[PDB]
């Protein structure tokens, strides 16, 4: 049943991964060479937002299934199983750096599983990596990397790890190859309990897999954002149409809602990765140039539209932004359209009030950050802790985001706060028709303004 | 419940839509100007290949719930709900023609008496229910109503069922008082479908007649999007059905039309993503996405003909191709837009003689070939159809699979052994899977997955 594991790498990918394979009964050590990082998850701390992580951390921790250490040698002699999950910031460096140490000190058969997103062909250079390790040792030791690539959300990590859509392992066919297949088999069973839901291929293919997911993902949205700017010229209203293909059954209703981009730190260097390696090898991928071209082009939308509006010149004029994170339920502001948005307010002299329910602190760290060159703008940025309040003596209201808080607002405490009763909506929140009777100038993306908008 | 009911076109989306209309208690009158094909209909006869409508009729008509006539006051008076569904064939500019449609709703404004609403159901470009409108008032000033959008979803060769089992209903109509009297009549009308499950969508007419062009698109990008990372695999070395299971067993993307191939054909996909390409070129705005889709399927319908070209030489001079598959998609015998025209015209221009197979296409490819390639005879002279799959690969040098009609999933490699010069597959379809090939020593050239050890 319970196997050793070692995790390498204790980010987001790699905290989620080891507690919660910890949580069904396999015995975890998590390695990070960063002391601090350890030093703070030993002291029962999570440096990340994520629901239900502490808590299971907490009692993996207690239960003996669960180590945080900076000890490599200790790490690589704890688990047959090695989880690479180190980071790749804008560079394999790290990765292939844990597979030498893998290497170095290994004493019997490992399975090394390329967890983290790296490009297809990585599996190879590890195997490349630790061989030559091997060699230097003249040791008989055999191993086989396997690709398993994550398919979590920020934010509902725990969950969708818990309960997976699928389990994609990539592995050799060769000796090694099938007796690391019978190990990860092994290690995912309880989660093939009912429907089969591990899905195995060959590594390459399992590479791929993830560029292609969150491509196809990309895709959609910026599929459904052209439509939206059609629907304008057209009269037709998006969220119509979005219902109106979705409901075919080979289409589907998810990850076709308009808006003002697609933000994070997953889908948009994943398709310029894909862009990128692709163009290396001779293909320009047409498709996935233009969803890439789209959404650069419409997280300038919500600007855009307030430039029509109200002019060039915005000083003299302020703007309440509701929304800062680059999707709901994080404080991750990696590629937010928020921070494009405030960014091209300031620079034309708007004063800007923002609001974000958990996402404040980090918004005011990285746009501090992004207009460090121009202090003077910075003087017009404000943060406030209730949503309304944004609002005070506002030309209108900007949502960017959409989170739950704002569905529902109380319109009426709002309309004794801003100057005018405008709302530019970068994600279709509320009915046309109801702003209108509420006497509210609505500018949705993709769907007729309400009637004091037109 | 039952109402009186006018299908304007006696083609093919008109012929189920009244049919299977008729068929849960409506009485219908299909009216087309073509009294030879109003004819055949009359003399229990089909003029398309639409498996169970030729039954479906039969009871209708005996049931007295189902005409057909070439009658157009007749047709008028009868219908309180008048379908247009003509066609709306290209022209030498390639956009289609309205004339048909507007003929149709200019005769409704002539003739009618009372209220009527009158449906837009032909696939027709944003903005036509407001022409359609506009020359129904013409009609009406010189001597109420309202124009709605109702899009079909049919599948030729799947029509009846499609109809009679719909994944949605899209009604798309307007806002006032004639608009919400029109809405109600399109409920009572549908109410069989909505008996047990809600499937019907109300929106506005715009909204309608964009969701229609939307949707093919959509599907149209998942293909090209498959397509163009097939070609990637190769360069990677990777497996595009591998990764067609491991994106589509996302739920939010889903497993449906993603399968690689030789491209997409049809009379409805590159209509429906070239005329959004043109319209939105017409406001202003270039559709990246779209063009970029349509852009892959160009190239996508050379990929075959390149591999031969890449395994035999640019000179196809004494080579003999066998061709399985004809038809635009397995169950029908449409060659519009059909990859395999394409193929065909590319291998015969180098020379190379074929002999093609299809289970019920091969008149209609003969015939649209023959216009095609008009202009060599010497390369028609080199194209020959046989009744058997298996003839057709009689001293071929590679067989070529175009459409995946089941027939084809189960070959008698005993058979074709006894016929073929070099035992070498392209598939453009992905049948077979690439180790099974080299089992049976078979040259096995996919697209997007390595081949067998023989290619
Ligand atoms: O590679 C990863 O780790 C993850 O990347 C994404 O997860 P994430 O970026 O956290 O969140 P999404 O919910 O995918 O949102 C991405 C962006 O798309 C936007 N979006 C999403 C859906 C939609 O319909 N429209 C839309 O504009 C969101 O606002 C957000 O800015 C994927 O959804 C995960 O499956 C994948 O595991
Ligand atoms: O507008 C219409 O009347 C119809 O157009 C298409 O139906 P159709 O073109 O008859 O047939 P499809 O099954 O959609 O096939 C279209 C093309 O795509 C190709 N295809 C389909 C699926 C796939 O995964 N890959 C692929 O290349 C097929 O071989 C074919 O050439 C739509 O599927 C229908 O929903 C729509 O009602």
Redesign the interface.
């Known amino acids: 049943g319970s196997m050793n594991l070692t995790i390498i790498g204790s980010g987001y990918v790699g905290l989620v991964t080891g507690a919660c394979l910890a949580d069904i009964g396999h015995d975890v050590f998590c390695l990070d060479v960063d002391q601090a990082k350890i030093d703070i998850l030993n002291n029962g701390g999570v440096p990340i937002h994520e629901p239900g992580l502490k808590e299971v951390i907490a009692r993996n921790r207690s239960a003996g299934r669960l180590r945080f250490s900076t000890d490599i040698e200790a790490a690589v002699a704890h688990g047959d199983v090695q989880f690479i999950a180190v980071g790749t910031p804008p560079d394999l460096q790290y990765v292939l750096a844990a597979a030498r140490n893998i290497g170095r000190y290994m004493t019997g058969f490992k399975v090394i599983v390329d967890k983290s997103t790296v490009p ?2 990585t599996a190879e250079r590890v195997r490349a990596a630790v061989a030559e390790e091997l060699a230097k040792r003249g040791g008989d030791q055999m191993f086989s990397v396997v690709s398993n690539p994550e ?1 979590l959300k920020e934010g509902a990590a725990v969950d969708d790890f818990t309960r997976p ?2 389990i ?1 392992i990539g592995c050799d066919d060769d000796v090694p190859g099938e007796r690391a297949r019978e190990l990860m088999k092994k290690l995912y069973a309880p989660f093939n309990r009912n429907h089969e839901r591990t ?1 195995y ?2 590594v ?6 993830k560029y ?2 969150n ?3 990309a ?2 949205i ?2 459904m954002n ?2 939206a ?3 304008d ?5 998006i969220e ?2 979005r ?3 979705g ?6 209703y ?2 076709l809602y308009a808006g003002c981009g697609y933000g994070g730190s997953c889908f948009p260097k994943d398709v310029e990765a894909l862009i990128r390696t ?1 163009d290396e ?3 320009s ?7 890439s ?2 959404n650069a082009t419409q997280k300038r939308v919500l600007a855009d539209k307030i430039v029509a509006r109200f002019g060039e010149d915005l000083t003299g004029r302020t703007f309440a932004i509701w929304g800062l994170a680059f999707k709901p339920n994080t404080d991750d502001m990696r590629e937010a359209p928020s921070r494009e948005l405030i960014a091209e307010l300031l620079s034309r002299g708007a004063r800007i009030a923002a609001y974000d329910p958990v996402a404040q602190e980090e918004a005011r760290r990285v746009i501090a950050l992004d207009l460090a060159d121009h202090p003077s703008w910075l003087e017009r940025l404000s943060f406030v802790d209730d949503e309304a309040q944004a609002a005070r003596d506002a030309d209108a209201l900007v949502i960017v985001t959409e989170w739950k808080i704002f569905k529902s607002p109380d319109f009426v405490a709002l309309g004794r706060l801003w100057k005018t009763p405008v709302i530019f909506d970068g994600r279709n929140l509320y009915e046309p028709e109801t702003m209108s009777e509420q006497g509210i100038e609505y500018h949705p993306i993709g769907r007729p303004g309400s009637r004091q908008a037109v």
């Open positions: 297809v062909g398919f859509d699928r994609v899905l291929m060959d390459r293919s399992a590479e791929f897999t292609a997911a491509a196809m993902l895709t959609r910026s599929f052209e439509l700017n059609l629907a010229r057209f009269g037709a209203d119509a149409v219902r109106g293909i409901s075919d059954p080979r289409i589907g998810h990850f692709a090898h001779g293909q991928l047409q498709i996935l140039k233009a969803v071209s789209v």
